[PDB]
Tab-separated table of C-alpha atoms and ligand atoms in Angstrom:
chain	number	residue	atom	x	y	z
A	4	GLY	CA	-12.697	-11.549	20.331
A	5	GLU	CA	-11.703	-13.917	17.538
A	6	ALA	CA	-9.613	-17.110	17.325
A	7	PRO	CA	-6.324	-17.527	19.176
A	8	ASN	CA	-3.629	-15.738	17.147
A	9	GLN	CA	-1.303	-18.681	16.825
A	10	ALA	CA	1.482	-16.862	14.993
A	11	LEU	CA	5.087	-17.783	15.751
A	12	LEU	CA	7.348	-15.010	16.962
A	13	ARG	CA	10.860	-16.035	15.967
A	14	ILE	CA	13.789	-14.735	17.997
A	15	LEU	CA	16.966	-14.260	15.975
A	16	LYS	CA	20.562	-14.173	17.149
A	17	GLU	CA	22.862	-11.205	16.415
A	18	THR	CA	25.390	-13.714	15.003
A	19	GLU	CA	23.137	-14.490	12.002
A	20	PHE	CA	23.260	-11.029	10.354
A	21	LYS	CA	26.039	-9.812	8.056
A	22	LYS	CA	27.003	-6.805	5.839
A	23	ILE	CA	24.792	-4.268	7.675
A	24	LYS	CA	24.557	-0.833	6.002
A	25	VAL	CA	22.346	2.135	7.027
A	26	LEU	CA	19.352	3.590	5.131
A	27	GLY	CA	18.326	6.606	7.268
A	28	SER	CA	16.253	8.073	10.111
A	33	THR	CA	16.413	3.894	12.100
A	34	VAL	CA	16.379	1.301	9.279
A	35	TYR	CA	19.274	-0.815	7.923
A	36	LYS	CA	20.215	-3.083	4.989
A	37	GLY	CA	21.503	-6.519	5.896
A	38	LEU	CA	21.809	-10.240	5.236
A	39	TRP	CA	20.311	-13.013	7.335
A	40	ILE	CA	22.001	-16.435	7.340
A	41	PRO	CA	19.975	-18.940	9.430
A	42	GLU	CA	21.918	-21.517	11.459
A	43	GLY	CA	24.339	-23.019	8.907
A	44	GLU	CA	21.623	-23.480	6.268
A	45	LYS	CA	23.953	-21.848	3.706
A	46	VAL	CA	21.474	-19.283	2.341
A	47	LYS	CA	21.293	-15.501	2.177
A	48	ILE	CA	17.997	-13.789	2.954
A	49	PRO	CA	18.322	-10.034	2.359
A	50	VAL	CA	16.684	-8.054	5.152
A	51	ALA	CA	15.737	-4.666	6.462
A	52	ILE	CA	16.239	-3.931	10.156
A	53	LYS	CA	14.227	-1.295	12.048
A	54	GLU	CA	15.358	-0.055	15.510
A	65	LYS	CA	7.564	-1.858	23.569
A	66	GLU	CA	5.244	0.216	21.345
A	67	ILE	CA	7.575	-1.192	18.674
A	68	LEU	CA	6.584	-4.569	20.190
A	69	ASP	CA	2.995	-3.899	19.087
A	70	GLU	CA	4.183	-3.195	15.520
A	71	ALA	CA	5.999	-6.528	15.794
A	72	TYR	CA	2.890	-8.369	17.034
A	73	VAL	CA	0.973	-7.084	13.987
A	74	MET	CA	3.637	-7.780	11.315
A	75	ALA	CA	4.185	-11.192	12.906
A	76	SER	CA	0.465	-11.890	12.560
A	77	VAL	CA	-0.044	-11.042	8.845
A	78	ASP	CA	0.516	-13.320	5.811
A	79	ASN	CA	-0.419	-12.053	2.335
A	80	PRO	CA	1.355	-11.395	-0.977
A	81	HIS	CA	0.704	-7.607	-0.727
A	82	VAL	CA	1.623	-7.081	2.945
A	83	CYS	CA	5.045	-7.123	4.647
A	84	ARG	CA	5.604	-9.925	7.138
A	85	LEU	CA	8.018	-9.822	10.080
A	86	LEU	CA	10.683	-12.531	9.726
A	87	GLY	CA	11.595	-11.998	13.337
A	88	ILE	CA	12.794	-9.795	16.154
A	89	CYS	CA	16.237	-9.554	17.707
A	90	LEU	CA	16.854	-8.752	21.375
A	91	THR	CA	20.593	-7.966	21.372
A	92	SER	CA	21.286	-4.539	22.966
A	93	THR	CA	17.816	-3.254	22.011
A	94	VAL	CA	14.786	-4.557	20.114
A	95	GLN	CA	15.003	-4.933	16.321
A	96	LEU	CA	12.419	-5.902	13.720
A	97	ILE	CA	13.653	-8.037	10.819
A	98	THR	CA	11.841	-8.195	7.474
A	99	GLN	CA	12.535	-9.123	3.849
A	100	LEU	CA	14.493	-6.338	2.130
A	101	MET	CA	12.432	-4.592	-0.545
A	102	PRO	CA	15.209	-3.457	-2.859
A	103	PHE	CA	13.422	-0.588	-4.652
A	104	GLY	CA	12.297	1.092	-1.399
A	105	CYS	CA	9.123	3.144	-0.949
A	106	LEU	CA	6.793	3.700	-3.863
A	107	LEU	CA	6.606	7.441	-3.214
A	108	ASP	CA	10.319	7.799	-3.959
A	109	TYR	CA	10.011	5.284	-6.814
A	110	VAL	CA	7.360	7.221	-8.742
A	111	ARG	CA	9.233	10.488	-8.198
A	112	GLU	CA	12.447	8.805	-9.367
A	113	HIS	CA	10.695	7.511	-12.529
A	114	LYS	CA	8.133	10.247	-13.341
A	115	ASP	CA	8.905	10.051	-17.057
A	116	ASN	CA	9.365	6.259	-17.292
A	117	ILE	CA	6.144	5.130	-15.564
A	118	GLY	CA	3.187	4.042	-17.690
A	119	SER	CA	-0.522	3.419	-17.309
A	120	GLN	CA	-0.396	-0.342	-16.732
A	121	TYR	CA	1.968	0.018	-13.796
A	122	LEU	CA	-0.056	2.708	-12.041
A	123	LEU	CA	-3.258	0.683	-12.317
A	124	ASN	CA	-1.437	-2.527	-11.298
A	125	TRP	CA	-0.178	-0.934	-8.086
A	126	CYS	CA	-3.664	0.417	-7.276
A	127	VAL	CA	-5.017	-3.150	-7.428
A	128	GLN	CA	-2.143	-4.568	-5.436
A	129	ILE	CA	-2.583	-2.030	-2.655
A	130	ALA	CA	-6.340	-2.522	-2.423
A	131	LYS	CA	-5.640	-6.266	-2.413
A	132	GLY	CA	-3.363	-5.832	0.585
A	133	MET	CA	-5.802	-3.525	2.380
A	134	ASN	CA	-8.755	-5.864	1.858
A	135	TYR	CA	-6.668	-8.539	3.526
A	136	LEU	CA	-6.030	-6.281	6.494
A	137	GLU	CA	-9.784	-5.599	6.671
A	138	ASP	CA	-10.432	-9.365	6.919
A	139	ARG	CA	-7.878	-9.645	9.741
A	140	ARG	CA	-9.707	-6.747	11.500
A	141	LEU	CA	-6.640	-4.493	11.311
A	142	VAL	CA	-7.096	-0.785	10.762
A	143	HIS	CA	-3.808	0.447	9.283
A	144	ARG	CA	-4.272	4.122	10.249
A	145	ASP	CA	-1.213	5.264	8.222
A	146	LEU	CA	-1.748	4.236	4.598
A	147	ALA	CA	0.183	6.417	2.148
A	148	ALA	CA	2.555	6.021	-0.809
A	149	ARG	CA	5.551	6.226	1.560
A	150	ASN	CA	4.352	3.109	3.451
A	151	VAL	CA	3.925	1.126	0.239
A	152	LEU	CA	7.201	-0.584	-0.734
A	153	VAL	CA	8.478	-2.062	-4.007
A	154	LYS	CA	9.628	-5.716	-4.059
A	155	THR	CA	9.972	-5.538	-7.836
A	156	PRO	CA	8.605	-2.775	-10.074
A	157	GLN	CA	5.499	-4.980	-10.638
A	158	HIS	CA	5.083	-6.189	-7.046
A	159	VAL	CA	4.282	-3.794	-4.191
A	160	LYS	CA	3.589	-4.439	-0.484
A	161	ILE	CA	2.028	-2.478	2.382
A	162	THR	CA	4.180	-1.890	5.444
A	163	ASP	CA	4.581	0.307	8.554
A	164	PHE	CA	2.070	-0.842	11.190
A	165	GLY	CA	3.330	1.561	13.880
A	166	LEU	CA	-0.151	3.083	14.213
A	167	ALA	CA	-2.103	-0.051	13.149
A	168	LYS	CA	-4.935	-1.170	15.458
A	169	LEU	CA	-6.945	-4.384	15.776
A	170	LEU	CA	-10.735	-4.338	16.181
A	171	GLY	CA	-12.932	-6.709	18.165
A	172	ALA	CA	-15.560	-8.832	16.464
A	173	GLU	CA	-18.006	-6.467	18.141
A	174	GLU	CA	-16.145	-3.134	17.774
A	175	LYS	CA	-16.680	-1.194	14.509
A	176	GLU	CA	-14.545	1.919	15.283
A	177	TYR	CA	-11.324	2.850	17.156
A	178	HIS	CA	-11.075	5.901	19.436
A	179	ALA	CA	-7.638	7.603	19.673
A	180	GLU	CA	-6.105	9.019	22.872
A	181	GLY	CA	-4.127	11.810	21.148
A	182	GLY	CA	-0.888	11.256	19.222
A	183	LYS	CA	0.865	12.455	16.069
A	184	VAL	CA	-0.907	11.316	12.872
A	185	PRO	CA	-0.373	12.650	9.309
A	186	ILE	CA	-3.318	14.993	8.681
A	187	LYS	CA	-3.254	15.064	4.880
A	188	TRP	CA	-4.163	11.350	4.524
A	189	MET	CA	-6.702	11.344	7.327
A	190	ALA	CA	-10.414	10.988	6.866
A	191	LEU	CA	-12.585	13.746	8.265
A	192	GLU	CA	-14.000	11.674	11.156
A	193	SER	CA	-10.417	10.870	12.093
A	194	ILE	CA	-9.493	14.602	12.080
A	195	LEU	CA	-12.588	15.870	13.958
A	196	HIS	CA	-13.622	12.905	16.132
A	197	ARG	CA	-10.465	10.698	16.337
A	198	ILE	CA	-12.432	7.778	14.887
A	199	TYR	CA	-10.740	5.096	12.790
A	200	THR	CA	-12.454	2.462	10.661
A	201	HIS	CA	-11.672	0.416	7.586
A	202	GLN	CA	-13.592	3.194	5.782
A	203	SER	CA	-11.134	5.833	6.976
A	204	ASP	CA	-8.329	3.651	5.522
A	205	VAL	CA	-10.346	3.799	2.277
A	206	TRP	CA	-10.035	7.601	2.385
A	207	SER	CA	-6.281	7.236	2.840
A	208	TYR	CA	-6.187	4.798	-0.095
A	209	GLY	CA	-7.841	7.455	-2.270
A	210	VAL	CA	-5.126	9.962	-1.302
A	211	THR	CA	-2.463	7.324	-2.047
A	212	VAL	CA	-3.938	6.797	-5.533
A	213	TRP	CA	-3.911	10.581	-5.981
A	214	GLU	CA	-0.219	10.474	-4.918
A	215	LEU	CA	0.541	7.898	-7.632
A	216	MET	CA	-1.531	9.563	-10.360
A	217	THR	CA	0.376	12.825	-9.848
A	218	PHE	CA	3.742	11.026	-9.805
A	219	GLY	CA	4.489	11.653	-6.131
A	220	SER	CA	3.068	15.096	-5.525
A	221	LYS	CA	2.317	16.441	-2.071
A	222	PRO	CA	-1.322	16.617	-0.973
A	223	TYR	CA	-2.591	20.166	-0.518
A	224	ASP	CA	0.951	21.426	-1.221
A	225	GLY	CA	1.278	24.823	0.477
A	226	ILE	CA	-1.722	24.525	2.811
A	227	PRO	CA	-0.736	23.814	6.456
A	228	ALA	CA	-2.300	21.046	8.561
A	229	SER	CA	-4.397	23.490	10.582
A	230	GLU	CA	-6.444	24.643	7.595
A	231	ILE	CA	-7.200	21.042	6.455
A	232	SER	CA	-10.133	20.035	8.685
A	233	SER	CA	-11.787	23.347	7.728
A	234	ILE	CA	-10.993	22.922	4.014
A	235	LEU	CA	-12.647	19.501	3.925
A	236	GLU	CA	-15.636	20.731	5.930
A	237	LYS	CA	-16.223	23.393	3.224
A	238	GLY	CA	-16.440	20.638	0.550
A	239	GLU	CA	-13.044	20.983	-1.166
A	240	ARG	CA	-10.958	17.919	-2.109
A	241	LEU	CA	-7.708	17.137	-3.925
A	242	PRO	CA	-7.961	18.030	-7.619
A	243	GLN	CA	-8.327	15.731	-10.621
A	244	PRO	CA	-4.810	14.760	-11.744
A	245	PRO	CA	-4.114	15.723	-15.403
A	246	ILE	CA	-3.633	12.103	-16.449
A	247	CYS	CA	-6.891	10.905	-14.851
A	248	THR	CA	-10.079	10.315	-16.785
A	249	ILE	CA	-13.260	11.291	-14.964
A	250	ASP	CA	-13.790	7.529	-14.422
A	251	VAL	CA	-10.722	7.274	-12.182
A	252	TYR	CA	-11.291	10.607	-10.427
A	253	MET	CA	-14.854	9.610	-9.614
A	254	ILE	CA	-13.460	6.685	-7.628
A	255	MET	CA	-11.051	8.921	-5.738
A	256	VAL	CA	-13.835	11.348	-4.870
A	257	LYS	CA	-16.073	8.424	-3.825
A	258	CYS	CA	-13.312	7.581	-1.345
A	259	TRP	CA	-13.430	11.102	0.057
A	260	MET	CA	-17.149	11.186	0.749
A	261	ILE	CA	-18.344	12.531	4.116
A	262	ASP	CA	-20.379	9.376	4.845
A	263	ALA	CA	-17.915	6.611	5.781
A	264	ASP	CA	-20.373	3.883	4.723
A	265	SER	CA	-20.877	5.464	1.258
A	266	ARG	CA	-17.206	5.110	0.303
A	267	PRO	CA	-16.124	2.132	-1.771
A	268	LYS	CA	-15.113	-1.051	-0.062
A	269	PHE	CA	-11.608	-2.425	-0.621
A	270	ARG	CA	-13.075	-5.506	-2.367
A	271	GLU	CA	-15.053	-3.203	-4.659
A	272	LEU	CA	-11.920	-1.206	-5.320
A	273	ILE	CA	-10.009	-4.291	-6.434
A	274	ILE	CA	-12.706	-4.945	-9.018
A	275	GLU	CA	-13.030	-1.365	-10.247
A	276	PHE	CA	-9.286	-1.004	-10.683
A	277	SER	CA	-8.937	-4.507	-12.127
A	278	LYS	CA	-11.471	-3.791	-14.902
A	279	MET	CA	-9.558	-0.612	-15.769
A	280	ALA	CA	-6.255	-2.529	-15.833
A	281	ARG	CA	-7.570	-4.499	-18.864
A	282	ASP	CA	-7.428	-1.294	-20.914
A	283	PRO	CA	-5.249	1.196	-18.992
A	284	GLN	CA	-4.998	3.673	-21.857
A	285	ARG	CA	-8.787	4.089	-21.711
A	286	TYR	CA	-8.681	5.287	-18.084
A	287	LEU	CA	-5.294	7.021	-17.850
A	288	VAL	CA	-3.968	9.294	-20.566
A	289	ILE	CA	-0.214	9.469	-20.162
A	290	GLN	CA	1.738	11.470	-22.720
A	291	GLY	CA	4.381	9.075	-24.122
A	292	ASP	CA	2.592	5.964	-22.782
A	293	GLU	CA	3.373	4.065	-26.056
A	294	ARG	CA	7.034	4.498	-25.210
A	295	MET	CA	6.859	3.409	-21.519
A	296	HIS	CA	8.101	0.070	-20.206
A	297	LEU	CA	5.340	-2.483	-19.597
A	298	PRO	CA	5.203	-4.917	-16.680
A	299	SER	CA	4.466	-8.620	-17.203
A	300	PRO	CA	0.812	-9.426	-18.014
A	301	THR	CA	-1.333	-9.912	-14.907
A	302	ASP	CA	-2.716	-13.353	-14.133
A	303	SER	CA	-6.188	-11.851	-14.545
A	304	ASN	CA	-5.432	-10.164	-17.897
A	305	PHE	CA	-3.919	-13.435	-19.123
A	306	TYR	CA	-6.871	-15.449	-17.765
A	307	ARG	CA	-9.450	-13.346	-19.638
A	308	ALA	CA	-7.855	-13.704	-23.091
A	309	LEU	CA	-8.309	-17.485	-22.875
A	310	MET	CA	-12.152	-17.264	-22.883
A	311	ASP	CA	-14.634	-16.853	-25.783
A	312	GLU	CA	-14.679	-13.427	-27.491
A	313	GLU	CA	-18.445	-13.077	-26.821
A	314	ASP	CA	-18.002	-13.242	-23.029
A	315	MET	CA	-14.779	-11.159	-22.659
A	316	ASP	CA	-16.714	-7.861	-22.424
A	317	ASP	CA	-17.681	-8.635	-18.789
A	318	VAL	CA	-15.552	-11.660	-17.772
A	319	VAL	CA	-14.044	-11.478	-14.286
A	320	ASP	CA	-11.264	-13.660	-12.836
A	321	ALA	CA	-12.913	-15.214	-9.751
A	322	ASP	CA	-9.615	-14.949	-7.845
A	323	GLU	CA	-10.290	-11.189	-7.712
A	324	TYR	CA	-13.896	-11.517	-6.504
B	1	0WN	C1	10.865	6.008	1.543
B	1	0WN	C2	12.197	5.212	1.741
B	1	0WN	C3	11.988	3.782	2.160
B	1	0WN	O1	10.871	3.397	2.453
B	1	0WN	N1	13.100	2.913	2.221
B	1	0WN	C4	13.111	1.516	2.532
B	1	0WN	C5	12.290	0.916	3.491
B	1	0WN	C6	12.316	-0.481	3.681
B	1	0WN	C7	11.541	-1.156	4.634
B	1	0WN	N2	10.744	-0.483	5.602
B	1	0WN	C8	10.450	-1.029	6.897
B	1	0WN	C9	9.377	-0.445	7.565
B	1	0WN	C10	8.934	-0.952	8.771
B	1	0WN	C11	9.558	-2.056	9.330
B	1	0WN	F1	9.128	-2.536	10.486
B	1	0WN	C12	10.631	-2.660	8.693
B	1	0WN	CL1	11.389	-4.034	9.437
B	1	0WN	C13	11.081	-2.144	7.477
B	1	0WN	N3	11.636	-2.529	4.745
B	1	0WN	C14	12.477	-3.257	3.950
B	1	0WN	N4	13.248	-2.614	3.016
B	1	0WN	C15	13.163	-1.250	2.886
B	1	0WN	C16	13.951	-0.664	1.932
B	1	0WN	C17	13.928	0.708	1.741
B	1	0WN	O2	14.717	1.288	0.790
B	1	0WN	C18	15.414	0.594	-0.253
B	1	0WN	C19	16.011	1.577	-1.227
B	1	0WN	C20	17.503	1.495	-0.972
B	1	0WN	O3	17.779	0.170	-0.536
B	1	0WN	C21	16.634	-0.215	0.219
B	1	0WN	C22	10.792	7.513	1.909
B	1	0WN	N5	9.641	7.896	2.773
B	1	0WN	C23	9.830	7.487	4.192
B	1	0WN	C24	9.350	9.351	2.692
B	2	0WM	C1	8.470	0.704	-13.412
B	2	0WM	N1	9.018	1.499	-14.528
B	2	0WM	C2	8.773	2.921	-14.258
B	2	0WM	C3	10.458	1.283	-14.678
B	2	0WM	C4	10.865	-0.184	-14.755
B	2	0WM	C5	12.062	-0.444	-14.221
B	2	0WM	C6	12.710	-1.775	-14.176
B	2	0WM	O1	12.185	-2.787	-14.598
B	2	0WM	N2	13.980	-1.691	-13.621
B	2	0WM	C7	14.998	-2.637	-13.352
B	2	0WM	C8	14.929	-3.992	-13.667
B	2	0WM	C9	15.996	-4.840	-13.347
B	2	0WM	C10	16.005	-6.209	-13.622
B	2	0WM	N3	14.917	-6.869	-14.237
B	2	0WM	C11	14.807	-8.279	-14.425
B	2	0WM	C12	13.612	-8.716	-14.982
B	2	0WM	C13	13.383	-10.058	-15.216
B	2	0WM	C14	14.349	-10.985	-14.888
B	2	0WM	F1	14.126	-12.266	-15.110
B	2	0WM	C15	15.544	-10.579	-14.333
B	2	0WM	CL1	16.736	-11.755	-13.935
B	2	0WM	C16	15.777	-9.235	-14.100
B	2	0WM	N4	17.095	-6.971	-13.268
B	2	0WM	C17	18.191	-6.431	-12.647
B	2	0WM	N5	18.191	-5.084	-12.374
B	2	0WM	C18	17.112	-4.295	-12.717
B	2	0WM	C19	17.178	-2.948	-12.409
B	2	0WM	C20	16.118	-2.109	-12.727
B	2	0WM	O2	16.102	-0.764	-12.456
B	2	0WM	C21	17.032	-0.021	-11.664
B	2	0WM	C22	18.231	0.426	-12.452
B	2	0WM	C23	17.935	1.864	-12.851
B	2	0WM	O3	16.690	2.260	-12.283
B	2	0WM	C24	16.441	1.325	-11.231
B	3	0WM	C1	7.361	-2.812	-24.220
B	3	0WM	N1	7.119	-1.679	-25.165
B	3	0WM	C2	5.695	-1.247	-25.092
B	3	0WM	C3	8.040	-0.516	-25.029
B	3	0WM	C4	9.307	-0.689	-24.185
B	3	0WM	C5	9.758	0.371	-23.487
B	3	0WM	C6	11.002	0.323	-22.663
B	3	0WM	O1	11.616	-0.711	-22.499
B	3	0WM	N2	11.434	1.534	-22.127
B	3	0WM	C7	12.577	1.870	-21.345
B	3	0WM	C8	13.591	0.971	-20.987
B	3	0WM	C9	14.696	1.398	-20.229
B	3	0WM	C10	15.744	0.560	-19.832
B	3	0WM	N3	15.807	-0.801	-20.216
B	3	0WM	C11	16.949	-1.656	-20.072
B	3	0WM	C12	16.726	-3.004	-20.332
B	3	0WM	C13	17.737	-3.938	-20.179
B	3	0WM	C14	18.995	-3.552	-19.761
B	3	0WM	F1	19.950	-4.471	-19.618
B	3	0WM	C15	19.237	-2.212	-19.501
B	3	0WM	CL1	20.804	-1.712	-18.998
B	3	0WM	C16	18.229	-1.268	-19.653
B	3	0WM	N4	16.790	1.068	-19.073
B	3	0WM	C17	16.837	2.393	-18.707
B	3	0WM	N5	15.812	3.228	-19.097
B	3	0WM	C18	14.761	2.744	-19.849
B	3	0WM	C19	13.767	3.638	-20.211
B	3	0WM	C20	12.667	3.210	-20.966
B	3	0WM	O2	11.655	4.059	-21.351
B	3	0WM	C21	11.576	5.456	-21.034
B	3	0WM	C22	12.603	6.322	-21.718
B	3	0WM	C23	11.915	6.748	-22.997
B	3	0WM	O3	10.525	6.858	-22.715
B	3	0WM	C24	10.263	6.074	-21.544
C-alpha cells in the first residue's frame, strides 16, 4: 500500500486519429493530432482486463518502458501509445542476423535491464518479459512493452499467486511453472532467456521440445545452451539468472552494471564473426563519460548514473 497513484488517464477523441493502417493479430499504425495543435504524433493502437493493462502503462514513466498516451472509448476500448517504427526486437534481430554487432547486443541488454529495474522500483512484476515484448524506437533505443499479464505488489507482499491462465512456459521461472509464484526474481529468469534470444539472433528456446517436458527438463538440471558467440563470462550471467534459488539470481541493478562493464569492450565478451564490418551505434553516455577521466582510474571507473 504505497502512495496515491496520481497518474493522469487521458481520454482521446476518435476525430484526432488519421491514416490508420493495420499491423496484425489487434494493433494498428496511426497518427495522432491533438486539438488543433498542428503536430503529428505517430501512434500504435491496440484493440476491462485491457483496462488493467491501461492502468499500468498509464502509470509508468521511464526511457526504457512504453507509456500509454491515452485510451479511446469510441465503439470499443483502445490503447494509444507512441509508434515504435522498427517493431519488436525479436523480429529485428532475425531480420538483421548478419548486420548486428557486439556493441548493439550489449547495449540492448543494458537498456532492458534498465527498464526492468525501473519496473522493480514501481513494484510491478512484468510476468511476460521476452524479446517479442521488447520494441525498437531506434536501432540504439529499445523499450519494454506488453503489460497484459503485469501485476503490482504491495509494500508488504513479496510474491504473486496466479489463479490459472495462459502464460508462455519457455520464459517462465521454475517456481512460476510448478508453484504459480511470480517475483521480480522470476522476471530475472525471463530476462536471462531474452538475452539468450538476442545472443542467438532470435532463436527459439528449447526448439523442438514441447511445453509439457519443460518443467521436468529444468528439474533435472538442464538449461539453454551457451550461444556460439558468447564468452563464458556472458553465459555465466545467463546461468546465474536460471538458478533454482530465486534470491541467488542477479538483481536487475546488478545486471545493468555487469552488462555495462562489458559494453566498454564488447569484442572481449562477444565474439561475432565479421564484427569489424558491422555497423556501430552512437557511443553510450557512459562509454563517453569514462574516456574523459584519468588513464590510471579508467580500469574500474563507473558512471554513477548507472549505479
Ligand atoms: C513482433 C511485432 C511487433 O511487435 N510489432 C509492433 C508492435 C508495436 C507496439 N506494440 C504494442 C503493444 C502493446 C500495447 F498496448 C500497444 Cl498500445 C502497442 N507498439 C507500438 N508500435 C509497434 C510497432 C510494431 O511494429 C512496427 C513494425 C512495422 O511498423 C510498426 C512479433 N512478435 C509478436 C512475435
Ligand atoms: C542495428 N543494426 C543491425 C543495423 C542498423 C540499422 C540502421 O541504423 N538502420 C536505419 C537507419 C535509418 C536512419 N538513420 C538516421 C540516423 C541518424 C540521423 F540523424 C538520421 Cl536523420 C537518420 N534514417 C532513416 N532511415 C533509416 C533506416 C534504417 O534501416 C531500415 C532500412 C533497411 O533496414 C531497416
Ligand atoms: C562503423 N564501422 C565500424 C563500420 C561500418 C559498418 C556499416 O556501416 N555497415 C553497414 C551499413 C549498411 C547500410 N548503410 C547505409 C547508410 C546510409 C544510407 F543512406 C544507406 Cl541507403 C545505407 N545500409 C544497408 N546495409 C548496411 C550494411 C552494413 O553492414 C553489414 C553488411 C556487411 O557486413 C555487415
